[PDB]
UniProtKB/TrEMBL annotation, chain E:
InterPro entries per record: bL37_actino
UniProt protein name: Uncharacterized protein
Pfam families in UniProt: HR_L37 (PF26427)
Stretches for region Disordered: 1-23
Length: 136, 126, 192, 37, 23, 176
RNA sequence: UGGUUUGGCACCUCGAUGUCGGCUCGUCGCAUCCUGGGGCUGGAGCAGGUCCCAAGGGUUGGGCUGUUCGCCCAUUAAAGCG
RNA sequence: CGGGGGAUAAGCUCCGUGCGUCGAGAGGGAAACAGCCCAGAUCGCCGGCUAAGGCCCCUAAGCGUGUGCUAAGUGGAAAAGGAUGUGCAGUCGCGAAGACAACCAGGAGGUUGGCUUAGAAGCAGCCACCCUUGAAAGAGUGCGUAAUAGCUCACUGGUCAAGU
């Protein structure tokens, strides 16, 4: 559960959802990484669930990284009410993603266990993804 | 095993044969590791007993005139070299074979000529 | 530490523009431009297949000798661009060079060895800048780690280098770090 | 006759075959035997 | 429902180039 | 392919005749007919052997070559020797006896169960607990063997039923 | 996936679309209550748990609230969901 | 087409567009279908040439020609995911020094490695995952017993013969 402390304005427009990624397109820091292809949004709950999933399988050794943060908010008004008449309230936070961006990275000398854990993580997210290696 | 390993083994067995006065061929099938270790301990005083593969030994035999043994390498083969003396190793193998009943002596090599099982028995007795 | 040139062929581009460039790309040709102190830019084509072969054989940085209309030249692959998704070589930069020049080249570094059970291996920096002669560029650098404990910060300067090379990056740069293996409690605490 | 959209060779002794357009795995252990559908 | 999916899917006939009134 | 390459041997004491696609064989045990698949042709070697050839290496030909070869080998070996199977019954108070061409079983049901013997096969019993079945066609032998086997449900507890010669059934013990 | 409850859009009908249950009378689907056939079991057997195929027939009578819903009284194989 | 309100929902609503059409527009095309494609009706002619779409019969025109794919009525309903289906293109490894599978022998000795437990011997768990003889033994992928014990397997030798 990662939440930003404060923001100048507490709500914004819908996230931009077109184009191809520009920066952070190369796996770097550790030895293995994950990159996505489709376009969607990811939230703190999903991030934490994926982190716990990778944790409970990596167990003793290794250590992870996260390259995103759901800071941009989204709004949702009380249910069963006439639309309009004012904004709703911010309920859950998300961060956008574009093809080529790197989501997670890992370092663990046992390649097979590392790959199996990473596949466990991939089978989790709501976006198509695949594993990548540090070497070109 | 790599081709380099095969060449190294060929050279090793060739030099061992060159440095050994004579040698014999036996069958190692159906023998328990305990009895193999016992035989190795018994023979270690004078001779050396190992295992070699048919194709490798056939290729290595081209150096000397031991090429006549090619027909005796059909099936499992165990190779024993006698660096010292000639007869004591033969007696040891004969007694071990007649005790175990699971070892058959394929033949031997003496004075540049292959000799059959009866000749091996006679020369061992001598 | 000596290497040998890799031979290739090239042709002069007839048209300049995105349309023709990516038409050639689809056909199977990778456009390229060469330039240097000679003050004479030239833009050519290269065979993608042999280009990839040479790169995979001799790393990112390799010595290339090019045949253009019967003329010979020596060039270096200064920079490369890779499609993030398709991993294609859209364009490569060639820098002419003659024997006996000082050039700035980025070189990768690898690490190998055995680590104690109570230690973990991390690599903050994967490439280190090294200056040397054009024909004397190492293909890779290696560092051996054995029986290290606790803080064993290895600086770039500490790394052994071959002769005829100079370390341009400041020695204070940290390349390899080794730390105490983590604990489950602290690891789970992280990011809470 | 575990019926799930996806099947796997749960243990090493599972083998996969194709029948009448439907693919299922047979194994000595009945627990390891299932068909998709 | 089934009704809705039909008309939108039936719009993908090459005759109309894919664009039709009312989706 | 690999299994169809080797020609099928033919002994001297068997007659073989070929009429286009159809093939018939005459031997001491009897005679049988056969129709062969059209994609594959069959030829007879002058050295008392049968050679089967495929025109092309596609999937259907690769599949049918081996099938034709093995089927020819099976039918020739059957007409030469034949086929027999032995059966045994385990349990307490289980019996079997022969009445002419018909055979009856006693597995402990309230009423007896009888099985008719179709043509081309015969039933032989040497002991009240063991019998055998004989015939010429392996497929018929196997069919009748399976039918006889399926009389009783599997019993992984006491093993009561009918079991083949070398067939071992898993057994699990119920504590309660 | 279904559009069957509570919901959002006002597009056909304010020179009229008459309204909840009950009585009588059907017709249809299967996401199966029994009746039918199988398999896996932490399946001695009776008896249980779960999955698969299957829509020919049946699915009581009473007390309480107008009630829908719901609780209760006595048997049968069941007192099925829309 | 570029946007806001909405649950990135509506055949929803509110904007901007020297933007199209219908409204105020027949014909032909998609079975029927105002807002989609082509095309702008002065009138007559038992005349020729064409756009959009079509050429087995309904129904006018090709059961056209040349090279390739399809076993599913996919053609003629949709996603996470799964799989010894299949063709093309590219790999490294091994392969006549006998590849792979298949069909005989050996797969052992400190050893029950320590903590843990009633119990831990290879198989509830944690640490090294050390080493010996070798051809090969992995603190052993499992289905085996409370714990021993067996069935084994990993790599490897003997026979067949090239793809794996
Ligand atoms: Mg940026
Ligand atoms: Mg996903
Ligand atoms: Mg599952
Ligand atoms: Mg729309
Ligand atoms: Mg209205
Ligand atoms: Mg109206
Ligand atoms: Mg009205
Ligand atoms: Mg009225
Ligand atoms: Mg009415
Ligand atoms: Mg009413
Ligand atoms: Mg059903
Ligand atoms: Mg039932
Ligand atoms: Mg059940
Ligand atoms: Mg039914
Ligand atoms: Mg009926
Ligand atoms: Mg009342
Ligand atoms: Mg829009
Ligand atoms: Mg919008
Ligand atoms: Mg409106
Ligand atoms: Mg408007
Ligand atoms: Mg108009
Ligand atoms: Mg009109
Ligand atoms: Mg019309
Ligand atoms: Mg006009
Ligand atoms: Mg015309
Ligand atoms: Mg046209
Ligand atoms: Mg016509
Ligand atoms: Mg046609
Ligand atoms: Mg063709
Ligand atoms: Mg269809
Ligand atoms: Mg799909
Ligand atoms: Mg998949
Ligand atoms: Mg073994
Ligand atoms: Mg030990
Ligand atoms: Mg343990
Ligand atoms: Zn299994």
């Amino acid at each position: 559960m990662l939440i930003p402390r404060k923001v100048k304005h507490r709500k914004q427009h819908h996230p931009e959802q077109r184009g191809i990624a520009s920066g952070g397109t190369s796996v770097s820091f550790g030895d293995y990484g994950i990159q996505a292809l489709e376009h969607a949004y990811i939230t703190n709950r999903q991030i934490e669930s994926a982190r716990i999933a990778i944790n409970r399988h990596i167990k003793r050794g290794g250590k992870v990284w996260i390259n995103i943060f759901p800071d941009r908010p989204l709004t949702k008004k009380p249910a069963e009410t006439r639309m309009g008449s004012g904004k709703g309230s911010p309920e859950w936070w998300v961060a956008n993603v574009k093809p080529g961006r790197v989501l997670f990275e890992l370092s663990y000398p046992d390649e097979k266990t590392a790959r199996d854990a990473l596949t466990r993580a991939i089978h989790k997210l709501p976006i198509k993804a695949r594993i990548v290696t540090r070497e070109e | 095993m790599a081709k380099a390993d095969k060449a190294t083994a060929v050279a090793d067995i060739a030099e061992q044969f060159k440095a050994s006065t004579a040698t014999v061929v036996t069958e190692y099938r159906g023998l328990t590791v305990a009895n193999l270790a016992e035989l190795r301990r018994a023979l270690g005083d004078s001779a050396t007993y190992t295992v070699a593969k048919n194709t490798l030994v056939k290729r290595a035999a081209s150096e000397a005139g031991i090429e006549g043994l090619d027909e005796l390498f059909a099936g499992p083969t165990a190779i024993a070299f006698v660096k010292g003396e000639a007869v004591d190793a033969a007696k040891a193998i004969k007694k071990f074979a007649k005790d175990n009943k699971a070892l058959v002596i394929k033949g031997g090599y003496m004075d540049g000529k292959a000799l059959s099982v009866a000749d091996v028995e006679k020369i061992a007795d001598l | 530490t000596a290497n040998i040139p890799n031979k290739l062929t090239a042709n002069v581009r007839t048209r300049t523009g995105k349309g023709a460039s990516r038409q050639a790309r689809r056909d199977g040709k990778v456009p390229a431009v060469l330039y240097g102190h000679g003050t004479d830019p030239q833009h050519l084509e290269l065979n993608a297949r042999d280009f990839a072969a040479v790169l995979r054989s001799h790393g990112t940085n390799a010595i290339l000798t090019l045949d253009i209309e019967g003329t010979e030249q020596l060039a270096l692959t200064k920079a490369l661009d890779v499609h993030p998704i398709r991993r294609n070589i859209q364009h490569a930069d060639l820098l002419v060079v003659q024997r006996g020049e000082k050039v700035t080249v980025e070189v990768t570094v690898l690490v190998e060895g055995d680590a104690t059970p109570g230690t973990l291996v991390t690599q903050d920096a994967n490439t280190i800048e090294i200056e040397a002669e054009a024909l004397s560029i190492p293909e890779q650098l290696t560092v051996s780690v054995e029986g290290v404990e606790a803080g064993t910060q290895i600086t770039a300067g500490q790394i052994s280098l071959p002769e005829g090379v100079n370390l341009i990056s400041d020695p204070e740069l940290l390349v390899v770090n080794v730390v105490e293996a983590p604990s489950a409690e602290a690891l789970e605490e992280e990011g809470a | 006759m575990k019926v799930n959209p996806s099947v796997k060779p749960i243990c090493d002794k599972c083998r996969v075959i194709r029948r009448h357009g439907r693919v299922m795995v047979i194994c000595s252990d009945p627990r390891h035997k299932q068909r998709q559908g | 429902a089934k009704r809705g999916r039909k008309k939108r899917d039936r719009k993908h006939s090459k005759a109309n180039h894919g664009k039709r009134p009312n989706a | 392919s690999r299994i169809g390459k080797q020609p099928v041997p033919v002994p001297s004491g068997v007659d073989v005749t070929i009429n286009g696609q159809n093939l018939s064989v005459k031997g001491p045990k009897g005679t049988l007919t056969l129709d062969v698949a059209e994609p594959i042709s069959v030829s007879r070697a002058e050295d008392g052997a049968i050679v089967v050839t495929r025109p092309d290496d596609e999937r259907r030909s690769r599949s049918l070559h081996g099938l034709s070869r093995t089927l020819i080998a099976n039918l020739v070996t059957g007409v030469t020797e034949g086929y027999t199977q032995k059966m045994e019954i385990f349990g307490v108070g289980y019996r079997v006896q022969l009445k002419g061409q018909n055979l009856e079983f006693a597995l402990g049901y309230s009423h007896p169960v009888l099985i008719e013997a179709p043509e081309g096969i015969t039933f032989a019993v040497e002991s009240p607990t063991k019998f055998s079945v004989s015939g010429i066609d392996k497929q018929k032998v196997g069919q009748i063997s399976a039918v006889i086997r399926r009389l009783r449900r599997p019993d992984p507890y006491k093993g009561k039923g009918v079991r083949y010669e070398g067939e071992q059934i898993r057994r699990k013990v119920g504590k309660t």
